[PDB]
Amino acid sequence: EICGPGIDIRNDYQQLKRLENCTVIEGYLHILLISKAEDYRSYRFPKLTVITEYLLLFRVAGLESLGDLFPNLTVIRGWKLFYNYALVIFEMTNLKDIGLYNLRNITRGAIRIEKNADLCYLSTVDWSLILDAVSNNYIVGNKPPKECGDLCPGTMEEKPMCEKTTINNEYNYRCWTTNRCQKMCPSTCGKRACTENNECCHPECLGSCSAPDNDTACVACRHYYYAGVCVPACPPNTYRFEGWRCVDRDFCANILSAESSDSEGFVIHDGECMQECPSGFIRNGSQSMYCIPCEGPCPKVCEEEKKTKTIDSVTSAQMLQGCTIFKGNLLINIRRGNNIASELENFMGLIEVVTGYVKIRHSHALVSLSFLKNLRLILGEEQLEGNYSFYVLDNQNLQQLWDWDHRNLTIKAGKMYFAFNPKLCVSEIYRMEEVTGTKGRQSKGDINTRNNGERASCEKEQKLISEEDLN
Ligand SMILES: *[C@@H]1O[C@H](CO[C@@H]2O[C@@H](C)[C@@H](O)[C@@H](O)[C@@H]2O)[C@@H](O[C@@H]2O[C@H](CO)[C@@H](O[C@@H]3O[C@H](CO)[C@@H](O)[C@H](O[C@H]4O[C@H](CO)[C@@H](O)[C@H](O)[C@@H]4O)[C@@H]3O)[C@H](O)[C@H]2NC(C)=O)[C@H](O)[C@H]1NC(C)=O
Ligand SMILES: *[C@@H]1O[C@H](CO[C@@H]2O[C@@H](C)[C@@H](O)[C@@H](O)[C@@H]2O)[C@@H](O[C@@H]2O[C@H](CO)[C@@H](O)[C@H](O)[C@H]2NC(C)=O)[C@H](O)[C@H]1NC(C)=O
Ligand SMILES: *[C@@H]1O[C@H](CO)[C@@H](O)[C@H](O)[C@H]1NC(C)=O
Numbered sequence: 056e057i058c059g060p061g062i063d064i065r066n067d068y069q070q071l072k073r074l075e076n077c078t079v080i081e082g083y084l085h086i087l088l089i090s091k092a093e094d095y096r097s098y099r100f101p102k103l104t105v106i107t108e109y110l111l112l113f114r115v116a117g118l119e120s121l122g123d124l125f126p127n128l129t130v131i132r133g134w135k136l137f138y139n140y141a142l143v144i145f146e147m148t149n150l151k152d153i154g155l156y157n158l159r160n161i162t163r164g165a166i167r168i169e170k171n172a173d174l175c176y177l178s179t180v181d182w183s184l185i186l187d188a189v190s191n192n193y194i195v196g197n198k199p200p201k202e203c204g205d206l207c208p209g210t211m212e213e214k215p216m217c218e219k220t221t222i223n224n225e226y227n228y229r230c231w232t233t234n235r236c237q238k239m240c241p242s243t244c245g246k247r248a249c250t251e252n253n254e255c256c257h258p259e260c261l262g263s264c265s266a267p268d269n270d271t272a273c274v275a276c277r278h279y280y281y282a283g284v285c286v287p288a289c290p291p292n293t294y295r296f297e298g299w300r301c302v303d304r305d306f307c308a309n310i311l312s313a314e315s316s317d318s319e320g321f322v323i324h325d326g327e328c329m330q331e332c333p334s335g336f337i338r339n340g341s342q343s344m345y346c347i348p349c350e351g352p353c354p355k356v357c358e359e360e361k362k363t364k365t366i367d368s369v370t371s372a373q374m375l376q377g378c379t380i381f382k383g384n385l386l387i388n389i390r391r392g393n394n395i396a397s398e399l400e401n402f403m404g405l406i407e408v409v410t411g412y413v414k415i416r417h418s419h420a421l422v423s424l425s426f427l428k429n430l431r432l433i434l435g436e437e438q439l440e441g442n443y444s445f446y447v448l449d450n451q452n453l454q455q456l457w458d459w460d461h462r463n464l465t466i467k468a469g470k471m472y473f474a475f476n477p478k479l480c481v482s483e484i485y486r487m488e489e490v491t492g493t494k495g496r497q498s499k500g501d502i503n504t505r506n507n508g509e510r511a512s513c514e515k516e517q518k519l520i521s522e523e524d525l526n
């Protein structure tokens with residue numbers, strides 16, 4: 056049967072029993088960190104014929120051959136890879152050979168056969184028969200051919216049974232083990248598979264087949280599998296799923312059905328049943344199976360554990376990246392200021408709306424609030440003591456807010472307070488008021504002219520600080 060998604064086997068060999076019914080592993084297979092006992096015997100899963108992504112064996116000892124486990128693995132489709140590799144075999148102690156003696160096609164990605172001290176029967180395999188892109192294989196740290204002394208079936212008596220290819224200007228016999236030769240097909244068949252008796256398969260059959268010229272006798276499909284048939288494409292009203300099979304809509308619509316997911320569910324876009332809409336699309340309603348183009352960066356509501364996000368750096372604003380709506384409060388408190396105003400804007404420039412309030416305090420690094428490039432509205436659903444939506448205090452260099460000519464912003468509810476911005480002419484402050492519609496909701500210690508703009512050419516008034524500021 057089909058088992059998915061990626062099976063992750065490890066620490067106990069006995070976990071390899073999770074694989075006893077799988078004929079197809081829809082996803083990857085990981086076998087790490089296991090140690091088979093020389094004492095205890097062994098498993099063997101002849102049912103496994105296909106793995107839709109990659110096969111990765113890492114740091115496993117006691118296993119002396121993979122054909123021992125998967126004597127019938129025939130295709131590793133490589134629909135998703137472990138970093139370019141469809142087949143990774145690393146630090147596999149004891150492994151004396153690959154033995155994957157029915158492996159006939161790695162549809163995608165390459166292979167990595169690294170530090171396997173005793174691995175042999177390695178130079179005797181013709182990976183170009185199995186893989187296209189052999190140039191990308193990565194091989195090193197295995198057992199040296201001259202110490203291996205491999206002999207293909209027949210070599211020792213005197214009736215070679217294996218075929219010969221040339222690999223790296225060496226013309227020799229190809230085989231997976233001493234008793235098993237690598238299978239090849241009659242040239243007649245061309246780019247097609249063939250039976251055990253060298254009979255060509257249907258052009259759709261991938262890997263191999265039970266009866267020639269029959270598209271229902273495949274061991275795998277070249278393209279898509281469907282209703283017992285290797286199809287060259289999915290039939291109308293059935294959709295590609297996982298790169299290898301066609302599934303109808305109620306199947307797609309019922310995939311998380313054994314689970315209580317609060318997430319938006321599977322969608323069907325461009326003929327494929329997939330868990331999520333394509334990059335610039337959005338589901339046209341919540342839990343609709345239909346994806347529609349966003350028409351700009353897709354809407355994205357960001358909301359964190361705490362209510363007030365305090366951005367005290369450029370690194371701290373990382374999470375804001377991509378967001379259109381910040382549900383919470385922004386406390387922008389940036390002191391250190393190389394040039395964080397273009398860096399910040401690649402993080403905060405997309406925010407159109409803040410649901411809470413915006414507090415700018417101690418932000419000496421800043422000269423303008425213009426990196427909030429998309430901010431169109433502040434909702435004021437939560438406000439500082441006093442009823443403040445917009446609160447700006449102790450800002451040494453702030454010269455402007457936003458450009459009150461090139462830009463528009465609105466404060467649905469709440470009011471503002473300004474203090475201790477020496478480079479910030481009250482004029483801007485007075486303009487912002489008109490624009491945001493917060494004009495008229497302001498007390499008058501709010502916009503003081505004694506410590507706001509005091510040291511900037513402009514064009515409770517002549518004092519630097521006052522009792523009015525202790526309020
Ligand atoms: C999300 O998208 C689905 C799928 O719709 C398809 O893709 C969309 C992205 C868009 O391209 C659609 O045009 C396309 O179908 C939407 O499902 C469709 O939903 C509409 C909603 O009513 C259905 O159409 C209706 O069919 C009725 C029965 O035949 C017909 O009576 C209706 O006509 C009456 O109402 C219309 C609509 O307002 C009116 O203009 C007419 O004059 C008349 O009074 C109406 O056409 C489609 O059949 C849909 N179903 C399917 C299976 O495709 C889905 O609604 C949408 N979700 C959200 C939240 O928008
Ligand atoms: C391993 O198997 C694939 C199977 O081919 C598929 O079916 C073809 C008829 C074609 O339409 C492809 O899309 C399918 O992948 C081999 O790769 C295909 O090779 C054919 C012929 O070279 C080529 O036209 C396709 O583009 C290839 N398909 C893909 C996805 O690349 C591949 O060559 C086989 N590897 C070896 C060593 O034989
Ligand atoms: C597989 O099937 C057998 C019998 O149907 C069952 O006992 C075993 O628990 C199953 N293993 C899995 C992983 O399904």
Ligand SMILES: *[C@@H]1O[C@H](CO)[C@@H](O)[C@H](O)[C@H]1NC(C)=O
Pocket residue numbers: 269270271272
């Ligand atoms: C292929 O083989 C199956 C069973 O042997 C058969 O029933 C099906 O009809 C065959 N396909 C053709 C085209 O004959």
